[PDB]
Amino acid sequence: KAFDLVVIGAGSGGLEAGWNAATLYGKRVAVVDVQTSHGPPFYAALGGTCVNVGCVPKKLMVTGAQYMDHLRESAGFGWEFDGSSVKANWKKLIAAKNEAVLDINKSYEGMFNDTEGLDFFLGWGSLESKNVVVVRETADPKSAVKERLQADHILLATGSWPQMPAIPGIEHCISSNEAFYLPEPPRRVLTVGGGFISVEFAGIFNAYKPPGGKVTLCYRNNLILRGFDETIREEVTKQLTANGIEIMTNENPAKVSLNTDGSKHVTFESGKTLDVDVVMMAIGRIPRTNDLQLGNVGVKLTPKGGVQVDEFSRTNVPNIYAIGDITDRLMLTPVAINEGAALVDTVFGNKPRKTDHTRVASAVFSIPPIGTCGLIEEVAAKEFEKVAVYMSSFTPLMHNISGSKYKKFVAKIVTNHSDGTVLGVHLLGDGAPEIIQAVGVCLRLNAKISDFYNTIGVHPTSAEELCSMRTPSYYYVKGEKMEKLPD
Amino acid sequence: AFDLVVIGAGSGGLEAGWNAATLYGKRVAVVDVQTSHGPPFYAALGGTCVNVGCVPKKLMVTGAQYMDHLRESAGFGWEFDGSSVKANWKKLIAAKNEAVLDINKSYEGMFNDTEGLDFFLGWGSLESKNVVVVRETADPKSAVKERLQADHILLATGSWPQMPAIPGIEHCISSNEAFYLPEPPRRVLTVGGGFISVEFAGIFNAYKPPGGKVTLCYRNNLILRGFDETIREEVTKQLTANGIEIMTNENPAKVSLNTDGSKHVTFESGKTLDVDVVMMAIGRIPRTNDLQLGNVGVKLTPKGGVQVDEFSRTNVPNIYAIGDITDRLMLTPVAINEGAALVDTVFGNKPRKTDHTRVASAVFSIPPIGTCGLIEEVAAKEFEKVAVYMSSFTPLMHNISGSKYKKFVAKIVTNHSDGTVLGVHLLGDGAPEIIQAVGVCLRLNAKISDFYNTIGVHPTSAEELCSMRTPSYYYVKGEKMEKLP
Ligand SMILES: Cc1cc2nc3c(=O)[nH]c(=O)nc-3n(C[C@H](O)[C@H](O)[C@H](O)COP(=O)(O)OP(=O)(O)OC[C@H]3O[C@@H](n4cnc5c(N)ncnc54)[C@H](O)[C@@H]3O)c2cc1C
Ligand SMILES: Cc1cc2nc3c(=O)[nH]c(=O)nc-3n(C[C@H](O)[C@H](O)[C@H](O)COP(=O)(O)OP(=O)(O)OC[C@H]3O[C@@H](n4cnc5c(N)ncnc54)[C@H](O)[C@@H]3O)c2cc1C
Ligand SMILES: c1cc2c(ccn2C[C@@H]2CCCN2)cc1-c1ncc(C2(N3CCCC3)CCCCC2)s1
Ligand SMILES: c1cc2c(ccn2C[C@@H]2CCCN2)cc1-c1ncc(C2(N3CCCC3)CCCCC2)s1
């Protein structure tokens, strides 16, 4: 049992690395994971966090939640039906999501069965020595050895895990992992955190809650979605509120106790209280380092806690590499994929390649959604003497007719005003995740604002607003926001 | 005494007029036959796109998409009384009419509030090289209202539905009248394979009353000529899957009235069909007849467009033509771009010409199309080595929604000598929005490697464009083969 590559973690990065090494370069590859399909007790599984308890099921569930808006919005276009007959069956949503994820699990299991030199091992991987991965029955080092895999190269690709704050009654709370399997939709739920997971699940629960229900999102600071464009952070807050979600800023739970009926009594640091049926912690995700026994071989962590790597994903230990969320950088599936492919090209393909972590496009599947690529203006204004911001914002016509007039589309382009180079593009509104993909290609080509406004529009779309902005709306000069340039 | 007289207050004409008055302080007259949408002349102030084109058709396709949303919601756990469901066409048209009227009124205000920018109601024609006559009707013998003296004349009158010369053609409508049908037809035949026929087949399919049937006929073998061929076949299948009957290699030979007022269609093959509405959508032709072009000698192309050069100049010195009347790319953003460039050149001292290559466009079919640049059989004739990248897949949601037939198709066509992307063709939800920034990419001469070294946004349909690294097949000297020699 002597492999060219042993991958610990059969997820977005690990599977891309293993498949490429086996099929592009003829190498003998072992991949370790703890389950062959989604769900409790370990949640993630073959396919990784995105497939099993991440991007794939959450996108299905947001899609389900959007029908609340569609069914109401249809009336402005003449659709008539018994509005009081409308009900949402949560069990059906979960059951259908489970079937779709399981189809992917089954597909990947067929990939392993049929692909030469690509072998799957069920169990918990850890480092025994610099060239041996041990696979045990459980995450505990005292559990029994199942096999010892001799490895010329070892790839750490175990992902991240939900961070749970140490408050009394944390044990009465859940994370996103369990939210994917709730037996009933909560009539009242508190999602804790201001990041994409809290926001995305707020909108899911808001659509499936039974009558008399309320979704509350809380966030420790003043404005949700830190790191996103500030106009969009503010507009999403308004459009969430408009759809019935209570957003509770500058608040943070201090404890949770059980009510007589099994509901949860939340007390915030402020002294406020709230009764909910479910408390979902989504305050962050931390690199999954705890079970690998990295200290056995000396693999170093960063001051933040991710596995430390260079730009070629090398740890401090020769022939041990790390990619994806365990490196605690950009926690995105396509970045883990790109890193895995680059690693295998370099190590086995005599084709050195490194992942570019700038100008990466990403999305938030709030309702409506966010699509973004590159720098927000605050960040550009620190790196560039003259920054211009082009901004267009409006409720689309379709949504004046639908009756969802709160659904303002936002398009913003951030440039280095010295040569017009586009530094960032930020979008809020229907179709934004789809619009922004090719924008990432544009930024990788160093597009300037004039390449956008001299491209002929596609009409009628939201995307054509990106090609309709010729004149800055305002500027940052040496960090100072101002409407007109000096002089 | 006008710097510029514009005949046609549409997409191209209003952009030229506004820019000439507000950017360069010029004195501008703009003529159109109606101040607000609808019968009898359909187009009006704002043009075809505002009144009976892109804007109302997009609203109506959006309405039609609810038929799919209501049905697909069930797979995600939504229930409601299906027998209570009605698609109320009258409400749809009423909401659309008010949206269009709002824009009509906005442009009316533009004219009332902008100095140097003046509107004249009536029919414009060329009396002489420097005079536009405005009459009460399209009849050249109708009464004169105004005679506008013009340093420069802009022909921007658009295009008009083509109608075949068959007995009974008068009982057939065009897209113009479809926007104003008082009731949704139970049985409709749309005639033609182009985008308007396809888009309206989807609209009628959603709003038809019980017992209804939409039939689309096309005189040749495969609809949507000029679009990527993989997409033509697959959109045919997905229309069929949603209950539309596609009747290829058929063409109406005559139409008569049944005793209930419905239409009896006889095809050249001798087949017959009874329908409530026959909608002819076989083409749009440049709208030249009423302009009395023979007065001043403006030359036409063999196919009826006003001949222009790259700067939109006719053969008569201070007479120009933009938009659909030039019979090139009949798209609103192209007409807008031609108008703005023309004004920059004539009045701005910055010669600008419209680039008509690599223009992104869409079809709001259900499912929709997004396209930019060359299809592969055209590229194969201009380039010695062509690579075609192709991916088809089912979006995640349609493993749940009950609409398994909704395959997404992504195709990239390149010059295989240097990897330059010559065309991108998309079929599936999101495609019109995806393709806009693809147009920017092609203007930057993106190569295929620029797409596949860009990191995906996940999960989206658009990331498929960044996930194709190896040609599926090639054309070498115009010959299709799976592998290069
Ligand atoms: C709710 C949620 C939504 C998300 N939505 C998006 C989205 O829309 N878009 C996006 O790009 N990203 C999204 N992400 C992030 C994305 O899921 C991750 O960035 C991606 O999965 C990281 O891939 P990875 O290869 O680093 O590890 P993972 O994909 O997490 O795979 C790691 C694997 O390691 C296994 N494992 C762990 N410990 C061991 C061990 N000791 N031995 C063996 N196997 C082990 C786990 O079972 C798991 O299968 C989301 C994440 C979450 C939680
Ligand atoms: C059903 C349909 C759907 C369409 N959908 C799209 C789409 O989604 N996207 C897209 O980009 N394009 C679309 N188009 C095409 C778009 O409408 C045209 O390309 C665009 O309007 C052309 O602009 P123009 O300046 O050439 O003329 P138009 O906008 O057609 O304006 C011409 C104007 O001239 C007026 N007029 C005509 N003759 C005279 C005269 N003698 N005197 C005075 N006034 C006169 C007419 O009333 C009209 O208002 C669609 C067209 C149709 C018919
Ligand atoms: C599935 C199933 C597969 C095989 C091979 C055999 N069977 C089973 C067969 C299929 C038909 C009948 N039974 C391969 C697969 C793959 N799915 C995805 C794969 C990619 N990535 C690599 C890792 C996960 C992600 C690489 C290729 C591009 C897309 C992403 S490889
Ligand atoms: C299936 C499915 C695949 C992909 C890529 C994406 N999805 C989609 C699935 C859906 C969920 C997860 N991803 C690839 C496949 C393949 N099937 C067979 C393949 C091989 N040969 C190649 C020629 C025919 C035989 C390759 C060599 C080893 C096995 C045989 S590659």
Ligand SMILES: c1cc2c(ccn2C[C@@H]2CCCN2)cc1-c1ncc(C2(N3CCCC3)CCCCC2)s1
């Ligand atoms: C288990 C196993 C599950 C699935 C779905 C699939 N598989 C098995 C998969 C597929 C084959 C092998 N792997 C879901 C579950 C659960 N859903 C809810 C669970 C409970 N709690 C609430 C959620 C967290 C824990 C409530 C219900 C009673 C038990 C505890 S356990």
Ligand SMILES: c1cc2c(ccn2C[C@@H]2CCCN2)cc1-c1ncc(C2(N3CCCC3)CCCCC2)s1
């Ligand atoms: C409307 C209405 C307008 C005015 C001016 C006054 N009033 C009436 C007033 C305004 C406040 C209350 N009522 C202007 C307009 C215009 N609408 C669109 C115009 C643009 N394009 C040029 C024309 C064709 C389309 C101009 C360039 C930007 C893009 C759109 S100009």
